[PDB]
Design a protein around this ligand. Sequence first.
Ligand SMILES: [Zn+2]
Length: 48
Amino acid sequence: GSSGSSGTPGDRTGTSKCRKAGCVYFGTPENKGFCTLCFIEYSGPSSG
Ligand SMILES: [Zn+2]
């Protein structure tokens, strides 16, 4: 039950999309641009 949401539902999601290009989710200023998902990977080691 939102008051008047124009865009997409969420709390402290952000206005700009995730820094990454191949990412549908949105990004955040706290995650240095990246989104919740990426933000995690950023720290964790990636392979392939
Ligand atoms: Zn992302």
